[PDB]
């Protein structure tokens, strides 16, 4: 339950993403990365993929 590891999306960080998945460095499968701008620092990046507008 901390901001450390974040690497989960339904695709790659190139130009064809699909969905958000957040994975911590202790309890994998927490919240979400891509469509999840509830951080703006660790997610927004993996969300660079997702405009966070669905």
Swiss-Prot record:
The protein's job, in short, is: Component of the chloroplast signal recognition particle pathway. Required for post-translational targeting of proteins into the thylakoid membrane but seems to be dispensable for co-translational targeting with a translating ribosome present. May be able to function independently of cpFTSY and FFC/cpSRP54 in targeting LHCPs to the thylakoids. Acts as a highly specific chaperone for LHCPs, preventing aggregation and being able to dissolve aggregates.
What does the comment on domains in this protein's record state? The binding to LHCP occurs through the first ankyrin repeat and the L18 domain of LHCP.
Where does the UniProt annotation locate this protein?
Answer: Plastid, Chloroplast stroma
Gene deleted: what happens? Plants show a reduced level of the major light-harvesting chlorophyll a/b-binding proteins (LHCPs).
| Record-given protein name | Signal recognition particle 43 kDa protein, chloroplastic
The subunit field of the Swiss-Prot or TrEMBL record says: Homodimer. Component of the cpSRP complex, composed of a FFC/cpSRP54 monomer and a CAO/cpSRP43 dimer. Interacts (via chromo domains 2 and 3) with ALB3 (via C-terminus), but not with ALB3L1/ALB4. Can interact simultaneously with ALB3 and FFC/cpSRP54. Interacts with LHCP and LTD.
Q: How would you summarize where this protein is expressed among tissues? A: Expressed in leaves. Detected in roots.
Miscellaneous note of the record: Unlike eukaryotic or prokaryotic signal recognition particle (SRP), the chloroplast SRP from higher plants lacks an SRP-RNA component. It targets both chloroplast-encoded and nucleus-encoded substrates to the thylakoid membrane, post-translationally for the nucleus-encoded proteins and co-translationally for the chloroplast-encoded proteins.
Q: Where is the Chromo domain?
A: 2-54
> What species was this sequence derived from?
Arabidopsis thaliana
């Amino acid at each position: 339950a901390v901001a450390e590891s974040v690497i989960g999306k339904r695709v790659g960080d190139d130009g064809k993403t699909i969905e958000y998945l957040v994975k911590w460095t202790d309890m994998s499968d927490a919240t979400w990365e891509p469509q999840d701008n509830v951080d703006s620092t660790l997610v927004l990046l993996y969300q660079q993929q997702q405009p966070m507008n669905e």
